[PDB]
């Protein structure tokens, strides 16, 4: 078995192998890079997303959220209170305020240190799930625009034709800014583009261990589980690496530089923070391997949980029995 300790790897694949994305996707499992929940991907030299990023502070950002943290700085949920629309001009210039900005610090160690330590007591400004792009139409190689969509793959693998589409998504970090614990919707796989900015740091608990990472979680956050039989589903949730370690859960971690892709592989829960100013893209996908974890992921139906109109086919045809219980989830 290729990869059994489960540590995160790192590829650095050719221009030449960079072309075939299934094909490359496939060949990094090949190498076991799926056992630990997460790969990072270093495009090749001679790629770029597009020309520059001169021109993006235009870009609407409708909904800005402030993180605001409950808890001990090691154990805590974050809520979300809504702002008022800011360019991502105006954002960039709120993440570098003195308020805002990143502080002094030796390295990522030290760095990662201070956010651990002090997270809770502050609340960032996080700009998410804008959909658009910033790759140019005209990059051909793993443009995140142009990737085969998720309805095609079920249709391909399983012959159902389904309404729905996925399109990719924007995020605009800041300093502190937190996603927390949470595997992908309908157990999915997601790929992620660091475009431009500071780094962000992620945690990974491998698939085959994903059940340790729920069991803590339901004892670390009792009132949630009694609520929600699957309230990670919620992403509201953190608890540092320290907690992690002390009650023995599996884990690895490593920092995202702009320029720099990562996949998360189906039921790899992850979590992590921003360093500073950043862009990143990301977007769902799927391969065949996807379809027997689509059809085993929980779902909450407790109905704090966001519902993209395109999960709607995904339940329905690979969770049948589910299906009306979750669609009660509906509104
Ligand atoms: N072990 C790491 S980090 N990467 C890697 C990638 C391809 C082939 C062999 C090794
Ligand atoms: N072709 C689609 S829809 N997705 C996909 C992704 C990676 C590997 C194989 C297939
Ligand atoms: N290196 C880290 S992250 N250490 C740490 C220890 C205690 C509390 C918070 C962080
Ligand atoms: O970058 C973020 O804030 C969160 N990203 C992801 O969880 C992802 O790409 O799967
Ligand atoms: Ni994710
Ligand atoms: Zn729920």
Same mark, same amino acid.
């Given at each position: 078995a290729q990869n059994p300790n489960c540590n995160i790897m790192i590829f650095h694949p050719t221009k030449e192998e960079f072309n075939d994305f299934d094909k490359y996707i496939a060949y990094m499992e090949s190498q076991g890079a799926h056992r630990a929940g997460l790969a990072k991907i270093i495009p090749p030299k001679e790629w770029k997303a597009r020309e520059t990023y001169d021109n993006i502070s235009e870009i609407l950002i409708a909904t800005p959220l402030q993180q605001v943290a409950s808890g001990r700085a090691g154990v805590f949920t974050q809520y979300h209170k809504k702002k008022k629309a800011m360019t991502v001009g105006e954002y960039r210039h709120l993440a570098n305020s003195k308020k805002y900005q990143t502080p002094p610090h030796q390295n990522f160690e030290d760095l990662e240190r201070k956010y651990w330590k002090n997270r809770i007591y502050n609340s960032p400004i996080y700009g998410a799930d804008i959909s658009g792009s910033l790759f140019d139409e005209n990059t051909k190689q793993w443009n995140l625009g142009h990737l085969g969509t998720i309805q095609d793959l079920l249709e391909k693998e399983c012959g159902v034709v389904i309404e729905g589409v996925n399109t990719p998504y924007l995020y605009f970090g800041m300093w502190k800014t937190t996603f927390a614990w949470h595997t992908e919707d309908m157990d999915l796989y997601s790929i992620n583009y660091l475009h431009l900015g500071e780094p962000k740091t992620w945690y990974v608990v491998?698939? @085959?261990? #994903?059940?340790?990472?729920? *069991?803590?979680?339901? =004892?670390?956050?009792?009132?949630?589980?009694?609520?929600?039989?699957?309230?990670?589903?919620?992403?509201?949730?953190?608890?540092?690496?320290?907690?992690?370690? @002390?009650? #023995?859960?599996?884990?690895? *971690?490593?920092?995202? =530089?702009?320029?720099?892709?990562?996949?998360?592989?189906?039921?790899?829960?992850?979590?992590?923070?921003?360093?500073?100013?950043?862009?990143?893209?990301a977007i769902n996908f799927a391969t065949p391997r996807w379809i027997d974890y689509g059809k085993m992921a929980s779902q909450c139906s407790c109905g704090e949980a966001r519902v993209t109109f395109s999960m709607d086919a995904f339940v329905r045809i690979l969770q049948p029995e589910r299906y009306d219980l979750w669609k009660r989830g509906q509104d």
């Open positions: 491998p698939p @085959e261990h #994903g059940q340790r990472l729920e *069991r803590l979680a339901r =004892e670390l956050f009792p009132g949630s589980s009694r609520g929600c039989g699957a309230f990670l589903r919620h992403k509201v949730a953190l608890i540092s690496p320290t907690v992690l370690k @002390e009650n #023995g859960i599996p884990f690895n *971690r490593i920092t995202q =530089e702009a320029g720099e892709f990562m996949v998360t592989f189906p039921y790899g829960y992850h979590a992590g923070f921003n360093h500073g100013f950043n862009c990143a893209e």
